[PDB]
Design a protein around this ligand. Structure first.
Ligand code: HEM
Ligand SMILES: *[C@@H]1O[C@H](CO)[C@@H](O[C@@H]2O[C@H](CO)[C@@H](O)[C@H](O)[C@H]2NC(C)=O)[C@H](O)[C@H]1NC(C)=O
Ligand SMILES: *[C@@H]1O[C@H](CO)[C@@H](O)[C@H](O)[C@H]1NC(C)=O
Ligand SMILES: *[C@@H]1O[C@H](CO)[C@@H](O)[C@H](O)[C@H]1NC(C)=O
Ligand SMILES: *[C@@H]1O[C@H](CO)[C@@H](O)[C@H](O)[C@H]1NC(C)=O
Ligand SMILES: O=N[O-]
Ligand SMILES: O=N[O-]
Ligand SMILES: [Ca+2]
Length: 595
């Protein structure tokens, strides 16, 4: 890097080199380089940033500044002409449950968060971005093209604020701008426990010595725990229904209530922690609060690793799985475990797997009540539909029995996300996640499609006919060439997602490469990886080998009918089995006879 040692939060790291638990912040994982993979550091750059001014300004910022001699298209125009579709008939994934989409969002939240720069206080600035659509400093609004229906109902732009960056946070440094990752790069259940000391502690039950996570005190799920409420204003979850006045949940990750199924998934994970901590107490009555907390946390971290690497990545990466994530050979301390800037875009392939509706199903996996099925847009920042309309169980059934959207070159992102997205502070269900993704690519200084094709050892199409052959799609290639005049200029999110999916996977070759490398690195570069000799005992790892999502559900809801393979498409009752069929987590290897 241009000038090494520019970090604002570098010190305050007393690494206890025998401490057997992960830190919350991810510091002290790597011994030689203790900040590697820790939160609140720069995202890694696998390739040098590309900004219109070499330093900081996004391509598209200045009108008369070309990229390789062509203007970059408006993000919303690309969204409208390539990404949008009308007909939700036929879009569903006949071999992936809705859990497959949801696990992806969960894993993503474990690994990366690049928050908007801090300008939250009352001011003209953020409201003048919204109101007057005035580009400047961190305000980089998504301007509507002519012929955009939203022009007629919403104004001239959708607000957008540039991502935070390290070193000077209002002024800048002399290398290219580097965006921050606010969570730990390690797959470590940071979304459950938090990535900062403050939050980690606020989330805990330190009022009793049982090592429990705090649970909700105002509401219960047929006895089972809910996440605690986050009691700060303005609250988006209150804003979406002022009558119900039900707040957002408080979880290790800030985004937990963005949609009801993510909130759902967070609820399972918290309950798992508590069930593990109570189960541990009995087997080790002598263990204190810290000990029980840390040992539950460690088990939950392992669970997420296994589900991810054994269950999830094989049906994303398909044939490429082995090529990028060969079987584990042990911790390598030479591996950079940091999340890359490009990965935070590559893993947005999930956006094309989100379907337009969510169902609540009853115990016979039939519609729960008269509005069992709801449009996804009514479920952003929606906690009241959990609290006051059946709790978790009906939503979890729908995750099992309903299907993900299938990526489709003609039907990429459902209008529920493309046209009706809600964002805190902006008051309308009227934003476009696709447009935001594209603007964010520019904001983060992303190299274009051919740069990444080059990086990944893939052919770099220079013409329409070349692009037609790579996309295997003449009309999409044409639309991409008409908007971006060269494939060199195609934004990586749309370019990557445009490629046909590899055999037995759900992403194309380029994304398989970007994803596969990242996941290989977060495994191989993790000192606390579950299968690393020493982290667990031989017998502990024999127990952990048997975890399943199916089992998580059985332990932590009142559901009794589960598939064995929760991520594939399952129909009830054919592909469902009683919970007693399903292997448990045997915790007897954690018995410490410690006398
Ligand atoms: C209803 C479902 C979902 C909603 C509403 C949603 C919404 C969002 C929003 C608002 C952002 C912030 C975008 C920005 O300002 O740049 C975002 C970012 C992201 N989403 Fe999604 N998303 C969903 C599902 C998923 C899924 C299924 C995945 C992956 C399988 C995923 C992966 C990501 C990633 C990686 C980011 C970038 C995070 C970062 O590093 O900052 N999302 N999503
Ligand atoms: C806000 O939440 C309330 C409940 O907290 C929603 O509905 C209640 O909702 C339906 C009425 O259509 C029934 O369950 C009850 O008769 C209602 N009770 C109350 C307290 O009014 C209401 O529809 C929500 N509104 C929106 C726009 O989401
Ligand atoms: C913590 O534990 C005690 C006893 O287990 C319980 O009664 C109390 O409500 C818990 N506190 C919170 C807020 O989770
Ligand atoms: C570990 O990582 C480095 C990174 O390039 C690689 O060169 C080396 O061969 C690896 N060694 C082992 C044993 O994993
Ligand atoms: C469906 O998906 C699974 C992976 O989840 C795969 O192994 C299986 O062969 C597929 N079966 C069908 C019905 O295509
Ligand atoms: O209350 N905040 O999501
Ligand atoms: O989940 N996104 O804020
Ligand atoms: Ca993490």
């Amino acid at each position: 890097s241009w000038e090494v040692g520019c970090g604002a939060p570098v010190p305050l790291v007393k690494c206890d080199e025998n401490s057997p638990y992960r830190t919350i912040t991810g510091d002290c994982n790597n011994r030689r380089s203790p900040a590697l993979g820790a939160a609140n550091r720069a995202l890694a750059r696998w390739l040098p940033a590309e900004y219109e001014d070499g330093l900081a300004l996004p391509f598209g910022w200045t009108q008369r500044k070309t990229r390789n001699g062509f203007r970059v298209p408006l993000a919303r125009e690309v969204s409208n002409k390539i990404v949008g579709y009308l007909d939700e008939e036929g879009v569903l994934d006949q071999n992936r449950s809705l859990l497959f989409m949801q696990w992806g969002q969960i894993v993503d939240h474990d690994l990366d968060f690049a928050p908007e720069t801090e300008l939250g206080s009352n001011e003209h600035s953020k409201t003048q971005c919204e109101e007057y659509c005035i580009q400047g400093d961190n305000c980089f609004p998504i301007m509507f093209p002519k012929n955009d229906p939203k022009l007629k109902t919403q104004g001239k732009c959708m607000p957008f604020f540039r991502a935070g960056f390290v070193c000077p946070t209002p002024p800048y440094q002399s290398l290219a701008r580097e965006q921050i990752n606010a969570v730990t790069s390690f797959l470590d259940a940071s979304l459950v426990y938090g990535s900062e000391p403050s939050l980690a502690s606020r989330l805990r039950n330190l009022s009793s010595p049982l090592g429990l996570m705090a649970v909700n005190q105002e509401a219960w799920d047929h006895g089972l725990a809910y996440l605690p409420f986050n009691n700060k204003k303005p609250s988006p979850c209150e804003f979406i229904n002022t009558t119900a006045r039900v707040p957002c949940f408080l979880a290790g990750d800030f985004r937990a209530s963005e949609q009801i199924l993510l909130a759902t998934a967070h609820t399972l994970l918290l309950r798992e922690h508590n069930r593990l901590a109570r189960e541990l107490k009995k087997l080790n009555p002598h263990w204190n609060g810290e000990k029980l907390y840390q040992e539950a946390r460690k088990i939950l971290g392992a669970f997420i690793q296994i589900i991810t690497f054994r269950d999830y990545l094989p049906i994303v990466l398909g044939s490429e799985m082995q090529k990028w994530i060969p079987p584990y050979q042990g911790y390598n301390n030479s591996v950079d475990p940091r999340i890359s800037n490009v990965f935070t875009f590559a893993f947005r392939f999930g956006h094309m797997e989100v379907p337009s509706t969510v169902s609540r199903l009853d115990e016979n996996y039939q519609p729960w009540g008269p509005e069992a099925e709801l449009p996804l847009h009514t479920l952003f920042f929606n906690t009241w539909r959990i609290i006051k309309d059946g709790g978790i169980d009906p939503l979890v059934r729908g995750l099992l029995a309903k299907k993900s959207k299938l990526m489709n070159q003609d039907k990429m992102v459902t209008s529920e996300l493309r046209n009706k997205l809600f964002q805190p502070t902006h008051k309308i269900h009227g934003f476009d996640l696709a447009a935001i993704n594209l603007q964010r690519c520019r904001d983060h200084g992303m190299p274009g499609y051919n740069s990444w094709r080059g990086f990944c050892g893939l052919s770099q199409p220079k013409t329409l006919k070349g692009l037609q052959t790579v996309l295997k799609n003449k009309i999409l290639a044409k639309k991409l060439m008409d908007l971006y005049k060269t494939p060199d200029n195609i934004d990586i999110w749309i370019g990557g997602n445009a490629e046909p999916m590899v055999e037995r996977g759900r992403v194309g070759p380029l994304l398989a490469c970007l994803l596969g490398r990242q996941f290989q690195q977060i495994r191989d570069g993790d000192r606390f990886w579950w299968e690393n000799p020493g982290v667990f005992t031989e017998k502990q790892r024999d127990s952990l080998q048997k975890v399943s999502f199916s089992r998580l559900i059985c332990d932590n809801t009142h559901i009794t009918k589960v598939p064995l393979h929760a991520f594939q498409a399952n129909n009830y009752p054919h592909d469902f089995v009683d919970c007693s069929t399903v292997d448990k987590l045997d915790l007897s290897p954690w018995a410490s006879r410690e006398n």
